Structures are given as structure tokens and as C-alpha cells.
Ligand binder design. Structure first.
Ligand SMILES: Nc1ncnc2c1ncn2[C@@H]1O[C@H](COP(=O)(O)OP(=O)(O)O)[C@@H](O)[C@H]1O
Ligand SMILES: Nc1ncnc2c1ncn2[C@@H]1O[C@H](COP(=O)(O)OP(=O)(O)O)[C@@H](O)[C@H]1O
Ligand SMILES: [Mg+2]
Ligand SMILES: [Mg+2]
Lengths: 220, 220
């Protein structure tokens, strides 16, 4: 199944969601994480680096922490300017047909790669935050979803209180809410998924519940 | 420069030394880790798995945590069986040619891959514990070094007291003694080097001093 994480505004926790949700899913099922953002955030969250070579989409992958990560590369940049969304879409589907779950990380916009990842996604997932820029972003994403006729789940990040906006009929706001935590910044200094770092840093993990509920909700 | 970690008995810290020392050398210089153990200890130590493909020696490499790790693969099992020591040696020289430091993990024996990595190693290091069978292994390694005309540096693991033996004119015993540490098991369970774990696990780095010292003892 294809899980695409969408948000036209950066810093909302999109890469964190892709990385940690893919890792949580890897535990019982064969999971891949395809990194479509040229920044390569999700590539960095697995201890790696953006390839400074213009590579074909999906040709290269490395299995880190039992996740098949397709690392980011500068080839995306050209795709992200003059790409053919049908061909990237078919490529994403052809890769996903080898995984129980393919989580896709998208660049901070709604361009060619975001459209490619959205039209073939089985589920679209948007993080949301209380500051007003993410609120304008999610409202515009609802118009995106309608004009393409697609759904998207949403969940609240960087907060203790859950964010809900009820005129958005193509965005279902779940109850899931993730508060700030040392774990994210520490694991990012490490360059590992936050869940995996939690597995050994503390005894009773608290981050696993968020991504567990996210997985259960999208699996419906 | 090529560094080969050698030991006949498993469980002394061979992989742990390879991983941590290579990561330490990556701080300033271009460093590679060649995993020649078919079991893939160092490979696991970087969050990867051994390839179930018969790859050629030193073709797959991933940059994990600033280190060019060459993962273990079943092809090693072929080379360990009937590999020509000379050809394996020349290959290892090719692999290490482009690296300021090439650290090599070896299997728990003195077989084909191990002898091939010693015959070309610029320096050879052999961890020792105060365990009877490890004390025996260092004597056997002194024997094999004499048979092939090479030297090795030893240091103590799993102990606060340094181990030293007499009439082993081929192994220099250094004052470096590494004490037990929870950080080691935790970096194992997480799957990263321990010097990178303690980079965030604490505030005043502790384990890096021993590799700081070991680099100095083996560089002069
Ligand atoms: N719930 C959270 N609590 C604390 N820090 C977070 C949280 N979510 C994300 N971060 C931090 O925000 C930074 C950037 O977030 P990221 O996931 O890259 O967002 P995006 O990819 O959408 O820009 C990361 O360093 C991450 O550690
Ligand atoms: N100083 C230490 N204190 C505690 N545990 C250690 C120490 N050094 C290594 N270990 C643990 O011992 C286990 C085996 O060590 P390893 O280096 O793989 O042995 P080998 O030399 O057989 O490869 C690893 O799980 C590692 O975490
Ligand atoms: Mg990002
Ligand atoms: Mg081992």
C-alpha cells in the first residue's frame, strides 16, 4: 500500500512522519520509504546523504533498520522542474507493488512530484500545526484534493491540543496529536528514526503510540 | 593506510573495534569499513543486513554515518572456501587505495580472508580479554604473524586492567584498556556505532578517548 505524506509548507513534521511511520510499519510488514524531496531529509534520518548524481527514479535503494530506503538524489531536481507526472506515477506504482507499505516523502510544495505521489497514493497523510501558515496550507490542500478527487487524513503535530477544521470535507482530521519531545531532536542528531532511538533510550516507549494510531487509522 | 582487526575467538570486540575506530577516523579523513566476515557483524552495526547475493569483493558500499561501509555478502563464503590469497590481497589493496583509512573486519578465525587481510594490512590490531581462550588466541596469532612475518598491536577489552604476555615478540601490548559499558550494548541494539551513540547519549564524551589513543598508537 502507498502512503504519501503531503504538505506545501515546510517544517510541519512531514519528514518525521514519513521516517517514523515507515519504521513502525517495517516491523511486521515489508516496508519501503521513497524520498522524493531533493533536500533528502528522510535520507538523512537513516544515517545517509543525498547522492550528488542525477540517478533515475527508484533505481537505487538501501535497507537500513529493516526499511528499504530509496535515497534522495539531485536527479529529482530536474524531475521537479520538467518531469512527466504519468511516468513518475507509473514508476511509483511499479515500486510499490513490491512492498506491503511504501511511504513516500514529498518536497515542501504541491508540484510534479507531489502530484505524482498523490494520484497513485492509496492514502494521503498531512501533518498540521496550530500556527496559521499550516492552517492556510491544509485549507489549500483540501482544494487540491477536490480538484483531483482524492482523500487525505490529517493529524496534529507540535501540539498537545488536537487541531480540527470542519469545512474541509476532503480532509478527515483524526484525533492523533504529538507533543514536542527531546526524542525527535536527539534522534535527528543521531540520524536515526525516533522510534528506534526510543527502543533503547527508555523502557516504556511513548512515541510508538502516535504512529501506531496513525497506522491503524490509515489501514482502515 | 589499511587497518585489519584480527582475532580467532569471537566475542572479544573485533567488530566493535572495527566499527568504532572507522567511525572515529571518519571525523577528519576519508574512511572505509570492509566487512569480510560472512556473518556481517559490522554491517549489522551500521543498521544493514548482509546481502543474499554473490557480490564481487568491494563493489557494494553505502555511506552510513560518514563511513563507506562495504556490506558482507554470501560471496565471502565462496572466497573463504577456495579463494586465492594473492588475488584477494591485491583486490583489498585496490579497495583501500582511495581511502585515507581502510578498516577491515575479519571472521573469527585465521583463514583465507583473515590471512589475506593481514598480508596487506598496513597495521594489524588484535583485541584481547583477560579470558583464558583469548589469551590463547593472542599466542596463536603471534605464531601466525611469525609464520608470515608481520606484527600486531594488542589492547585490552572487557577489563579495566591491561593484559600483557611475554615471549610474544610479534604483538606489541599497548596500555589501552577499554572497560565495560552499557553504551556498547545500546549501540548494538540500536545498530549504530557507539561513538556516535554517546555523541548524544551524554554531554562529556567518554568512549572516544580510547580510539583517539589507539589511532595514535597505530599511526606512528
Ligand atoms: N513533535 C516534534 N517535537 C519536536 N521536534 C520535532 C517534532 N516533529 C518534528 N520535529 C523536528 O523538526 C525538524 C524538522 O522537521 P521535519 O520532519 O523535517 O519537517 P518537514 O520535513 O515537514 O520540514 C526536525 O529536526 C525534527 O526533529
Ligand atoms: N566493553 C564492552 N562492554 C560491554 N559489552 C561489549 C563491550 N565490547 C563489546 N561488547 C558487546 O559484545 C558483543 C559482541 O561484541 P563483538 O565486537 O561483536 O565481538 P566479536 O569480536 O566476536 O565480533 C556486542 O553485542 C557488543 O555490544
Ligand atoms: Mg522534509
Ligand atoms: Mg561479530
Amino acid at each position: 500500500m502507498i502512503v504519501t505524506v503531503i504538505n506545501q509548507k515546510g517544517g510541519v513534521g512531514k519528514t518525521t512522519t514519513s521516517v517514523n511511520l515507515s519504521y513502525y510499519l517495517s516491523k511486521e510488514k515489508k516496508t519501503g520509504l521513497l524520498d522524493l524531496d531533493p533536500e533528502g531529509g528522510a535520507t538523512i534520518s537513516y544515517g545517509m546523504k543525498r547522492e550528488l548524481k542525477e540517478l533515475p527514479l527508484g533505481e537505487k535503494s538501501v535497507n537500513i533498520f529493516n526499511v528499504e530506503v530509496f535515497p534522495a538524489h539531485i536527479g529529482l531536481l530536474k524531475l521537479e522542474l520538467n518531469g512527466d507526472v504519468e511516468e513518475i506515477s507509473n514508476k511509483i506504482k511499479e515500486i510499490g507493488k513490491q512492498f506491503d507499505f511504501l511511504v513516500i516523502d514529498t518536497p515542501p510544495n504541491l508540484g510534479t512530484l507531489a502530484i505524482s505521489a498523490m494520484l497513485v497514493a492509496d492514502r494521503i497523510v498531512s501533518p498540521v500545526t496550530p500556527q496559521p501558515l499550516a492552517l492556510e496550507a491544509i485549507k489549500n490542500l483540501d482544494s487540491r484534493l477536490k480538484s483531483i478527487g482524492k482523500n487525505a487524513y490529517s493529524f496534529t503535530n507540535f501540539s498537545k491540543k488536537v487541531v480540527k477544521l470542519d469545512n474541509l470535507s476532503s480532509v478527515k482530521f483524526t484525533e492523533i496529536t504529538i507533543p514536542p519531545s527531546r526524542l525527535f531532536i536527539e534522534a535527528s542528531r543521531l540520524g536515526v528514526p525516533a522510534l528506534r532511538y526510543e527502543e533503547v533510550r527508555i523502557k516504556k516507549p511513548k512515541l510508538a503510540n502516535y504512529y501506531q494510531q496513525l497506522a491503524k487509522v490509515i489501514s482502515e
